[PDB]
Amino acid sequence: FLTVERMVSPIESAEDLSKQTEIAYGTLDSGSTKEFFRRSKIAVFDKMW
Amino acid sequence: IFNSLWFSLGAFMRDISPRSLSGRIVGGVWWFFTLIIISSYTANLAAFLTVERMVSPIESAEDLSKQTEIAYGTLDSGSTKEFFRRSKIAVFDKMWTYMRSAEPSVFVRTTAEGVARVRKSKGKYAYLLESTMNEYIEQRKPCDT
Amino acid sequence: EIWMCIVFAYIGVSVVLFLVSRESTNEFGIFNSLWFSLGAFMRDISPRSLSGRIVGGVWWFFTLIIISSYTANLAA
Amino acid sequence: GECGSALSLSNVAGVFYILVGGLGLAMLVALIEFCYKSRAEAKRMK
Amino acid sequence: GECGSALSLSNVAGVFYILVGGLGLAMLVALIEFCYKSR
Amino acid sequence: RGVQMLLTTVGAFAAFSLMTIAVGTDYWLYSRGVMTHSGLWRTCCLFKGLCKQIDHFTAEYFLRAVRASSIFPILSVILLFMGGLCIAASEFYKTRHNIILSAGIFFVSAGLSNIIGIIVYISANAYSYGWSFYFGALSFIIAEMVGVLAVHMFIDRHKQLRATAR
Amino acid sequence: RGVQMLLTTVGAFAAFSLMTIAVGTDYWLYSRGVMTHSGLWRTCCLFKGLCKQIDHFTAEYFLRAVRASSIFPILSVILLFMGGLCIAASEFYKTRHNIILSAGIFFVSAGLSNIIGIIVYISANAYSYGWSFYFGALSFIIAEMVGVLAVHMFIDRHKQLRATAR
């Protein structure tokens, strides 16, 4: 339990968000952020959209 | 008292106290407690073996502003210097106010000079530069920045 | 090298025991003192004079930290 | 881009050191009180 | 696509059990030889 | 009886000379930067065949300075000198109990200085060791045994004195 | 003296009745699938308010069958019955040493059957416990103490016999 716990701690990323499904994430509707993701051509951001 | 203290030290470390059995509870509850301890620091160590991987203490501009051990500066004759000279943010103003009168001068005439100061200052110099250059240098030998 | 260390610890301890001995106590012989050093190195009564006492607790302490250490290293 | 198990003897070996200095001094005080007080009393008798 | 610390008492508790049966039998043989042979 | 004298002298010259040779060379034999040896003063290559001053030393200052100039092992040298000197002094001019015990103490503690110094060296050194280094550690050990025979002879003298006291 | 008799009887009826009640209900109280209780035979809800046969049972067979039908705790029941029965038998018809020791043995070992059975239950159960369950464990404990007073009175009788023997 001791080290199992203590060596843990995760730094994520937008890419980390893209690579997982446990934690949902989203944006405002009807806004420029949604247009950004809708029009993004970056693989991570496209995949997130 | 001397013999009792010896029973204390020898008790903590890994002979026979019992008589009163009113002293039993004291003895056992000791062995209990010290045992919990030794377990605790023991696995604490074993973790220190496993974990304890190093991390940089300070990663921000606010850390730089709050310290004087690590010097920092900018390129001369550039937009970064105009940024600090014209910044109204307390941290950036305070950093400019330090840097502009820090002795010896913390400013460099070339990016190469700033890199050389980072590389040669034993971690006692941090260089403020545009992110594109920083990430470029990050891909350069000796990969120390 | 750490093995050499423990060896030297052992010998120094034992001899120091016999020096504490300076009409005789239980550590009157080098052999018994060495035996004490061994049995302490592994997981029974030094105490009489309280002179040697402190030195013995020093021993148990020292080797205890040690074995703790090499054990953590092990599990690692 | 151009950037892409052991044992620490030292650490407690220091405590070996200190422990041993403790030993030597311990025995010093030991035989200095033994000799000093003990014999001082012995001749102090006659 | 639709797919994207504790303690085990049991394990050695069995050995508690067996250990204790060992106890009861041990004392049985004990007082049966004590009573039987002794008296 | 005289076995104490024999083991005493052979321990004195044995561990003493062995400690001196340990101070000489053959303390660390390994690849240089290309292989060479060194004896905590100057390293000597196999270019190859020459020598150079190699002991170019609150962590760097204190520890590095401590390892520098080989302070502890020289202390072992001087203390051993007092060992043999005070034993050869203990030959005559009886002084039943004082001198033998004294030289014994400074002699065993001298061994402690030797081993402690070895700890300082191996510590600060952070691939093979020098042989006369091993001669130095073994010298510390044999010294320890010599101290055993020393104190043993001393308490023997005590047994003679208190024995004849009645 | 008679304190042995008193503690003996109150231990007998105490731990015995407590074990029976432990067999009754209140062995596991927690959310069902909706919350209910159960006593290793049938669970009863708070739909709500009704009851149903809940103990619907070489790992599944042996372990599950062992936990089934509550074998060990019933063994504790029978053995306790022999406890009180053989002590009330030990009232008269002296038999200085045999009967008291016998009932003591089967009584303490009876406690062992109780605790072991509890182990079987908590084990096989793999959220809160039932209160009469705690009454069962406490019954095993008080039983153990009753055995302590039992054997203590027995060795007392031995002290009387061997004492008067001289």
Interface membership of B36 toward A (CB under 8 Å): no
Q: Is F31 helix (H, G, I), strand (E, B) or coil?
A: strand
With contacts defined as CB-CB under 8 Å, which chain D residues touch B139?
1-4
Would the CB atoms of B15 and C44 count as touching at under 8 Å? yes
Closest partner CB to C60 (pick from B3, B10, B45): B10
Contacts made by residues A26-31, CB under 8 angstroms, sequence distance 24+: none
Interface membership of A9 toward B (CB under 8 Å): no
Exposed (0-12), middle (13-18) or buried (19+): which is F24, by Cβ within 10 Å?
middle
Q: Which fold has domain F3-162?
A: Butyryl-CoA Dehydrogenase, subunit A; domain 3 (1.20.140)
Q: Is F70 helix (H, G, I), strand (E, B) or coil?
A: helix
Q: In 3D, which of G66, G72, G86 has the Cα closest to residue G19?
A: G72
Interface membership of B51 toward A (CB under 8 Å): yes
Q: Do chains B and A touch (3 or more CB pairs under 8 A)?
A: yes
B71-73 and B125-127 strand pairing: parallel
Token pair 């203390």: residue: F79
Q: Is B79 annotated as a binding residue?
A: yes
Q: Is B130 annotated as a binding residue?
A: yes
Token pair 């100061």: residue: B117
Give the helix/strand (H/E) hosting G140.
helix G131-165
Give the helix/strand (H/E) hosting G45.
strand G42-45
Q: In 3D, which of B138, B142, B133, B82 has the Cα closest to residue B107?
A: B82
Would the CB atoms of A5 and E4 count as touching at under 8 Å? no
Quote the CA–CA distance of B132 and F62 in Å, as a whole number.
43
Closest partner CB to A7 (pick from B43, B44, B50): B50
With contacts defined as CB-CB under 8 Å, which chain D residues touch C13?
23
* C33 touches B6 (CB < 8 A): no
Closest partner CB to G123 (pick from E13, E24, E27): E13
In total, chain B counts a number of residues equal to 145
Token pair 């951001």: residue: A45
Smallest CA–CA distance from B40 into chain A, residue: A2
* G24 touches G31 (CB < 8 A): no
* A27 touches A33 (CB < 8 A): yes
With contacts defined as CB-CB under 8 Å, which chain G residues touch E23?
112
Closest CA of chain C from D7, distance in Å: 7
Helix, strand, coil distribution of chain F in percent, nearest 5: 70, 10, 20
Angle at F16 between CA F15 and CA F21, to 5 degrees: 95
Q: Do chains B and D touch (3 or more CB pairs under 8 A)?
A: yes
Would the CB atoms of E9 and G101 count as touching at under 8 Å? no
Within 8 A by CB and 6+ apart from B127, the residues are B72, B73, B108, B114, B115, B117, B118
At G19, list the tokens: 């074990």
With contacts defined as CB-CB under 8 Å, which chain A residues touch E4?
21
Number of H helices, E strands in chain B: 7, 2
Smallest CA–CA distance from C54 into chain D, residue: D26
* F130 touches F118 (CB < 8 A): no
In degrees and rounded to multiples of 5, residue B58 shows phi and psi of -130, 130
* B96 touches B85 (CB < 8 A): yes
Quote the CA–CA distance of F18 and F21 in Å, as a whole number.
5
* G89 touches G107 (CB < 8 A): no
Quote the CA–CA distance of B34 and B13 in Å, as a whole number.
9
Closest CA of chain D from C34, distance in Å: 16
Would the CB atoms of C9 and D34 count as touching at under 8 Å? no
**What residues form DSSP beta bridges with B73?**
B127
* F8 touches F150 (CB < 8 A): yes
Closest partner CB to G119 (pick from E13, E27, E31): E13
Would the CB atoms of D9 and F112 count as touching at under 8 Å? no
Per DSSP, B66 falls in state T
Token pair 């090298």: residue: C1
Token pair 């001298």: residue: F110
With contacts defined as CB-CB under 8 Å, which chain C residues touch D5?
73, 76
Q: Where are the alpha helices (H) located in chain A, listed in sequence order? A: 2-6, 14-18, 32-39, 43-48
Measured from the Cβ of residue G40, the count of other Cβ atoms closer than 10 Å reads 22
Quote the CA–CA distance of F56 and G153 in Å, as a whole number.
84
Give the best residue of C10, C14, C58 to mutate against chain D (max D CB count within 10 A): C58
Q: Give the domain ranges of chain G.
A: 3-162
Give the helix/strand (H/E) hosting C3.
helix C2-21
Smallest CA–CA distance from D20 into chain F, residue: F112
The full 3-state SS of F82-100, as one line of letters, equals HHHHHHHHHCCCCCCCHHH
In angstroms, this model's resolution equals 7.7
Would the CB atoms of D9 and C58 count as touching at under 8 Å? no
Q: Is F12 left (phi over 0), alpha (psi -120 to 50) or beta?
A: alpha
